[PDB]
């Protein structure tokens, strides 16, 4: 809600294409994409 | 009272200073332009009360 | 670790570069770009 | 051996001593590139180190 | 029996300057426990006059006929209030010996001789032994003078024992070489049990026949108007924190009865549609009136109080002012200077159950801001999660070191509001729970913020050496 | 490939905690019936006299 | 007597035990319950 401070990693996989990694990416952050969404419903008119 | 000042002393405002640039000038940077001629050479004193 | 090594990093530029990361995110997205790696220094004042 | 000529400008906390002193001259916000000549006498924690 | 004998002999030397007698006394394990009492640091004592709450303020009056207020910063008065708290509790001889014991048959095989009228059998497991001083001002002594009692803990923890002078001389005042030689051979005249004001302490008064308050000629009287005066003092002592939990609840019912009872959700529990609220809030009714059954000086916002009367909490409630009172951060100060910085809170809570009519009134919770929203989530102070939040049979209270407030029916929705004291005078709120700072003894370092060995642990199991 | 039994996730529907999800009171029945026990409560029974009504008991 | 929540739309949730479970006892338990505090 206030704080928007990110992190970073660092991810040593064996998986090339890329479709494929964000399928691993999206299985392995759901609560850094509901995040996203809380923070698109609770603040509209704004540009995240 | 700060706009008397700057217009008595001869120096000017910072010409509003964005937030970027203060922290700019906060890592180091040159501001003083040149003069029009040095006759004599480059200005240098200082002041101590 | 984080105030491990806070305490190493005592410097101008340093300091300057964690206040550049001060602004939104999705241009925090666009201030970083991959320069590479780095082999051999020099230990100077400008480090080459 | 007097005790100080100049009681505005000694003191660990004086004008000069946070006017030119760098240590407190970084607390105020100055051009680094910038030459003031008291900084060679004021700055008492690279003298004493 | 050998610090009786130095007690007894310098209360001889400090008669001049303080005007006490020797009133010895032992204990048993009607009061203290065998585990509270082999590690029992120090006892404590001061005794309130008639007129008078206490010895150690000034004589005709006091300052401390004024409230708190509600106040942030001056907890109580100030710390002012510490230092004379402190200045007025004195401290007194003490031996345990820690095994069983006949007192007749210990006082026999030791040097002394008892004289009885009868031989009576008093069969106690552990011995404590510890002399108090009642005071005659003049003369004259007053039989509504009270002697309160502490007994301090290495942790920080006591208990309270107070007790009248008409229960201590009920019989004893109505029946009127060395000196460590004659006071070996004469000995001790008798003993008698002795209660406090609430009937729950049972303890022995030992009355020696060579004490040299014999031969002070003292006088004593004991009115009806006295004792009434020591009564209303009492009522006053006791009344101190359940008028503070009638506060809270007249608190809680004009903030209910302010907005109505349209109050928001303050604490991270979900909820589902289908379910009646009908049922909770009967059984609100109900647990509220259950905990305004079972309220006790050991609850949570005695607790909570209890660290904030302190000196410690005057400074950190300066200096958290002092950071929460501060402007926007310029960078001057983040490029060079030094940078800045409460991590998690440290609650207490009250937990009531309807459904089987049990309250559960110590409970410490460590609470916790959650991350995704702006709710509240607790947790345990070992680091699971508390479920009872869960359970649509139970209700909790909570109060924070803010002094705030929290009341969480099932579901998560909090009744907000803040404590009152401003009813209340301070000098009942200090000498009730009057936080108390542990002095040097034996087993512990000279400079604070130290490891800390093991006790002394004067023992009844090993060989005590 | 008949009807067999797995272990599906147990679906719920649920609501995630906001700061402006309200429980509503019902005023003209609950606070009315709240009325009489707040008005039956001040007077009597602080708790203050039981104790000191037992000492004063022992003293008589 | 029902509360004003602001999500309209209910949400299917993991049911985690690491959360807080959410006030799990049917009309059943309910009206049991409303038999023990009356009785």
């Known amino acids: 809600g206030p704080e928007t401070r990110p992190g970073i990693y660092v991810l040593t996989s064996s998986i090339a294409h890329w479709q494929t990694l964000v399928d691993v990416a999206r299985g392995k952050f759901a609560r850094e994409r509901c995040s996203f969404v809380n923070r698109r419903i609770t603040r509209p008119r704004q540009i995240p | 009272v700060d706009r008397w000042i700057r217009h008595a002393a001869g120096v000017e405002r910072p010409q509003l200073l964005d937030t970027e640039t203060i922290s700019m000038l906060t890592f180091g940077s040159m501001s003083e332009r040149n003069a029009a001629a040095t006759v004599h050479g480059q200005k240098a004193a200082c002041e101590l009360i | 670790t984080r105030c491990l090594l806070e305490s190493v990093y005592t410097a101008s530029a340093a300091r300057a570069a964690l206040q550049w990361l001060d602004l939104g995110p999705h241009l925090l997205h666009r201030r970083l770009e991959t320069l590479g790696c780095v082999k051999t220094v020099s230990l100077g004042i400008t480090s080459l | 051996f007097a005790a100080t000529h100049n009681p505005w400008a000694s003191q660990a906390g004086c004008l000069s001593d946070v006017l030119y002193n760098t240590r407190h001259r970084e607390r105020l916000g100055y051009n680094s590139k910038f030459y003031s000549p008291c900084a060679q006498y004021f700055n008492t924690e690279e003298i004493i180190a | 029996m050998e610090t009786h004998l130095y007690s007894d002999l310098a209360f001889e030397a400090r008669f001049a300057d303080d005007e006490q007698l020797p009133l010895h006394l032992v204990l048993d394990q009607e009061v203290l426990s065998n585990e509270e009492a082999e590690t029992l640091r120090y006892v404590y004592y001061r005794n309130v006059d008639s007129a008078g709450r206490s010895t150690g303020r000034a004589p005709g009056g006091d300052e401390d006929d004024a409230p708190a207020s509600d106040d942030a910063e001056d907890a109580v008065g100030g710390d002012r209030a510490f230092d004379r708290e402190r200045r007025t509790w004195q401290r007194a001889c003490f031996r345990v010996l820690p095994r069983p014991l006949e007192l007749l048959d210990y006082l026999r095989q030791s040097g002394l001789t008892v004289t009885l009228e009868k031989e009576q059998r008093v069969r106690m497991f552990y011995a404590v032994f510890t002399t108090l001083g009642l005071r005659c001002p003049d003369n004259r002594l007053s039989g509504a003078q009270t002697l309160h009692l502490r007994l301090v803990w290495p942790d920080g923890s006591y208990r309270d024992w107070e007790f009248l002078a008409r229960d201590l001389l009920r019989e004893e005042m109505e029946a009127n070489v060395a000196r460590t030689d004659e006071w070996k051979g004469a000995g001790v005249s008798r003993l008698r049990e002795v209660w406090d004001v609430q009937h729950r302490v049972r303890l022995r008064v030992l009355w020696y026949v060579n004490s040299f308050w014999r031969s002070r000629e003292l006088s004593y009287d004991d009115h009806e108007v006295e004792l009434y005066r020591a009564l209303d003092a009492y009522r006053a002592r006791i009344a101190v924190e359940y008028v503070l939990i009638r506060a809270v609840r007249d608190e809680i019912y004009a903030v209910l009865r302010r907005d109505g009872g349209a109050l928001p959700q303050r604490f991270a529990c979900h909820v589902s549609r289908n379910m009646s609220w009908r049922?909770?809030?009967?059984?609100?009714?109900?647990?509220?009136?259950?905990?305004?059954?079972?309220?006790?000086?050991?609850?949570?916002?005695i607790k909570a109080l209890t660290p904030r009367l302190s000196r410690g909490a005057a400074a950190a409630a300066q200096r958290a002012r002092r950071q929460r009172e501060r402007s926007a951060p310029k960078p001057q100060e983040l490029l060079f200077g030094p940078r800045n910085e409460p991590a998690e809170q440290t609650w207490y809570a009250d937990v009531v159950r309807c459904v089987r009519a049990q309250v559960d009134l110590g409970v410490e919770v460590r609470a916790a801001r959650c991350p995704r929203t702006g709710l509240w989530i607790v947790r345990d102070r070992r680091g699971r999660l508390r479920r009872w939040l869960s359970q649509p049979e139970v209700c909790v209270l909570y109060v924070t070191p803010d002094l705030d407030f929290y009341w969480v029916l099932p579901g998560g929705f909090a009744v907000s509001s803040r404590v009152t004291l401003h009813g209340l005078a301070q000098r009942a709120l200090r000498d009730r729970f009057q936080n108390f700072e542990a002095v040097l003894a034996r087993g512990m370092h000279v400079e604070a913020g130290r490891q800390e060995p093991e006790t002394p642990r004067v023992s009844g199991r090993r060989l005590p050496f | 490939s008949l009807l067999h039994t797995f272990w599906r996730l147990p679906v719920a529907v649920f609501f995630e905690?906001?700061?402006?999800?309200?429980?509503?009171?019902?005023?003209?029945v609950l606070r009315r019936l709240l009325e009489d026990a707040a008005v039956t409560m001040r007077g009597g029974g602080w708790r203050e006299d039981v104790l000191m009504d037992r000492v004063r008991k022992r003293y008589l």
């Open chain 5, 279 to 301: 049922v909770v809030w009967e059984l609100c009714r109900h647990a509220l009136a259950l905990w305004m059954d079972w309220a006790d000086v050991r609850s949570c916002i």
């Open chain 6, 17 to 28: 905690p906001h700061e402006e999800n309200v429980l509503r009171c019902p005023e003209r």
